[PDB]
Amino acid sequence: MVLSEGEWQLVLHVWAKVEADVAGHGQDILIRLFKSHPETLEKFDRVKHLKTEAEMKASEDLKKHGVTVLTALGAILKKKGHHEAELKPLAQSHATKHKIPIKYLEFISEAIIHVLHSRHPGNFGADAQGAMNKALELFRKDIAAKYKELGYQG
Numbered sequence: 836m837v838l839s840e841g842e843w844q845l846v847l848h849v850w851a852k853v854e855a856d857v858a859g860h861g862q863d864i865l866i867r868l869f870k871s872h873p874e875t876l877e878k879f880d881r882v883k884h885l886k887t888e889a890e891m892k893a894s895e896d897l898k899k900h901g902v903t904v905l906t907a908l909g910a911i912l913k914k915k916g917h918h919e920a921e922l923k924p925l926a927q928s929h930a931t932k933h934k935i936p937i938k939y940l941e942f943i944s945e946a947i948i949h950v951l952h953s954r955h956p957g958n959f960g961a962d963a964q965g966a967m968n969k970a971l972e973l974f975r976k977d978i979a980a981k982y983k984e985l986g987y988q989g
């Protein structure tokens with residue numbers, strides 16, 4: 836699949852807002868992920884013991900994790916589809932070290948869309964959401980192809 840420049844512009848325009856507060860968006864997204872799909876929390880040894888949203892909101896480790904995910908994702912989106920180099924080390928660590936099934940990448944995709952929708956209604960209408968979904972699907976498709984080459988494709 837391939838996105839048009841118009842679709843990339845919609846994605847990057849809302850992302851510019853996310854970047855005004857990377858830590859805040861990272862927390863919201865991870866908390867949304869962990870509450871909607873608790874099984875995912877088990878993958879994070881440094882934060883799996885957190886029982887409530889209040890504990891999550893106060894966690895310094897959770898906030899650092901959020902910044903890391905959004906910074907790596909942002910670097911990928913800014914490549915506008917030319918992200919093969921950025922995807923390799925990422926696919927290897929999630930396939931071989933962490934063992935993250937594609938299904939969980941779909942779950943975090945949902946959390947991202949949910950949060951942008953809440954915090955940026957004016958820059959996240961239907962067209963912009965369609966573009967973001969398309970960009971995240973592109974990301975998932977390429978990652979899963981890499982998973983298979985690496986022997987996981989879980």
Ligand code: HEM
Binds near residue numbers: 881924933935
């Ligand atoms: C847009 C999605 C994702 C991006 C861009 C991403 C990115 C990263 C990055 C940059 C790291 C740092 C170094 C490394 O590769 O180990 C990392 C670590 C990790 N990722 Fe992700 N990740 C994503 C989704 C997920 C999801 C959905 C899960 C689990 C449900 C996950 C679990 C992990 C774990 C377990 C680690 C290591 C945490 C630790 O240091 O203890 N990742 N990820």
